[PDB]
Design a protein around this ligand. Structure first.
Ligand code: HEM
Ligand code: HEM
Ligand code: HEM
Ligand code: HEM
Lengths: 144, 141, 141, 144
């Protein structure tokens, strides 16, 4: 929601280094592995029976890139997160009935993946800014 | 409920932590206090400045209690009974704060031990920390 | 983690249920489906109309499964392994739904056993159902 | 949020039968017994060390009547729960820092208490209507 200008710069600087072909799919894959009931919403994706099956699943990697693209849109619309995700909120809440705690889980898994990729560069202040971002995205997706 | 594979994953991952346990515990605390400032209301007697010796000392205590929980993973209520008395009976910590510290610990391990933070180990560690959190927030005397 | 007083409370309160076990289980299910309609997506193969014999039969299965959980309260993972297979491995039930059914069971018990539903018994029952819920949602084999 | 008129009548008819000097104190007391960490927010209330201590505590009973009055206010303003509870949201979220999951717990404890007092009169349709009320109050109180 409200990031200080220095917080906004730090978040934007790190995001520009994100590998858009792996981080998204790894976050989704880890969600399906660490919180296995989430697999129920992805019955059309095929083999999710082992962690390697999940992380290697082409539909997981493909869909993970789409999720990561939505986070990028939220990052450029921190003032109006409710409007950017209003469509996506209707999809997840009225069509899919995803319990919103799962939104919080995915945001925290993404934060783990960012820590995994950047190591010591993912400092506690940078994490603190990202927790505000993912909380705001999760709140927007549950708005409806 | 931990699987046999979970327990193996946790013991192997915690084995790689080694002498850095206290450092990781102090870093997880610092991450929690910064990311989730409401958690600081449980430590009003602490100097919470960056690099605080009090936070470093407490981080070592937290890490060593986790080490003890790893050692006694099939007998945690007995092994952690004193800590359950502290956190559930005396401090009355809201369970949400255990999710926050657990998340911050996972972030610290991912940042410092990337080769060890596989998806399977990530899952096993999350379950292990949830089980520890249940014991410390439960009154079972 | 259940205390010994918790186990005593659950065994005494659930003992008073008796031959009404199925009736209460079916009513808790009815309460869940009406109060929280998304839970109905797990039973598309069920007739969920009011007074359905199929819900009545299921409610007895659930009630009887809880009776089995009381009977094996000190080693629920092994006793409920088949139900964990079903709920965690096969149906992949989101844990939030266990909080919903658990709440509806407490509501049913409060409505039917008001003299027994003391605050202490309420606390012990809530913990017991939370413990059953963790077993049924955990993958441990 | 959206209660049908029949739900509004059922909710209102039962609420008019509530013992306003007991039900609130029983709801707050059960929250403190069943979810004992909530006691940390009430350190100035005295003895909360046993269930009988909590249930018999006069400050629990006194504060419980005010909570019940706030639910009564929400019942007569179901259209604008956010405005009715805007001031209470500021208190609980900015001054008290109560995690909003505890709002959901208290609403569900109240439902258990209504079931306790009304028995078979607390039918599954009547419960379904009250779950909509307490959900809306919990959401309004967490609005920020
Ligand atoms: C919290 C952050 C989340 C974001 C930003 C997000 C974003 C998205 C996006 C962009 C899509 C693609 C919609 C389209 O086709 O235009 C999508 C679809 C979908 N999402 Fe999410 N999502 C989130 C959380 C979740 C969670 C937690 C779950 C379930 C556990 C979930 C389940 C799904 C499913 C099942 C689809 C449809 C997939 C398909 O059939 O192709 N989402 N989401
Ligand atoms: C993985 C979960 C946790 C573990 C293993 C843990 C472990 C410990 C240990 C070993 C102590 C020291 C006991 C002693 O010195 O005798 C302690 C104290 C304490 N813990 Fe925790 N803790 C955990 C989570 C939390 C959380 C989430 C909070 C609050 C946000 C918290 C708040 C406190 C406080 C306030 C003290 C007392 C500090 C003092 O007075 O020195 N703990 N904990
Ligand atoms: C107190 C918690 C619960 C208990 C003790 C329980 C127990 C049971 C039992 C005994 C069965 C029958 C197993 C068999 O026939 O082999 C069953 C099946 C089933 N349960 Fe649960 N259950 C619980 C919670 C839930 C929840 C929360 C859901 C979803 C919202 C759910 C969904 C199902 C479904 C879909 C089936 C299969 C029904 C069928 O095909 O006959 N259960 N459960
Ligand atoms: C969810 C429904 C809730 C409602 C309708 C509600 C309502 C109220 C009201 C009307 C007051 C009195 C404020 C005044 O003096 O004007 C109050 C105060 C307070 N509430 Fe709540 N509340 C709710 C939930 C909670 C929860 C879940 C907690 C903590 C676990 C909590 C903790 C407190 C505390 C500590 C006070 C101040 C008590 C005092 O000053 O002695 N409230 N609330």
């Amino acid at each position: 929601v409200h990031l200080t200008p220095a917080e906004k710069s730090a978040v934007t600087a790190l995001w520009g280094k994100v590998n858009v072909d792996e981080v998204g799919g790894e976050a989704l894959g880890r969600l399906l592995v660490v919180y296995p009931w989430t697999q129920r919403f992805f019955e059309s994706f095929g083999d999710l029976s082992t962690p390697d099956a999940v992380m290697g699943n082409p539909k997981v990697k493909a869909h993970g890139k789409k999720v990561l693209g939505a986070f990028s849109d939220g990052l450029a619309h921190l003032d109006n997160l409710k409007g950017t995700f209003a469509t996506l909120s209707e999809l997840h809440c009225d069509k899919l009935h995803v319990d919103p705690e799962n939104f919080r889980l995915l945001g925290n898994v993404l934060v783990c993946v960012l820590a995994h990729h950047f190591g010591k560069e993912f400092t506690p202040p940078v994490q603190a800014a990202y927790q505000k971002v993912v909380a705001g995205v999760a709140n927007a997706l549950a708005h409806k | 409920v931990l699987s046999p594979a979970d327990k193996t994953n946790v013991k192997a991952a915690w084995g790689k932590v080694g002498a850095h346990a206290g450092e990781y515990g102090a870093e997880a605390l610092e991450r929690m206090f910064l990311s989730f400032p409401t958690t600081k209301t449980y430590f009003p007697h602490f100097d919470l400045s960056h690099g605080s010796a009090q936070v470093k000392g407490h981080g070592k205590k937290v890490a060593d209690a986790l080490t003890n929980a790893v050692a006694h993973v099939d007998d945690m209520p007995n092994a952690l009974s004193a800590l359950s008395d502290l956190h559930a009976h005396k401090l009355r910590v809201d369970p949400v704060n255990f999710k926050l510290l657990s998340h911050c610990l996972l972030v610290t391990l991912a940042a410092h031990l990337p080769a060890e933070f596989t998806p399977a180990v990530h899952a096993s560690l999350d379950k292990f920390l949830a089980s520890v959190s249940t014991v410390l927030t439960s009154k079972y005397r």
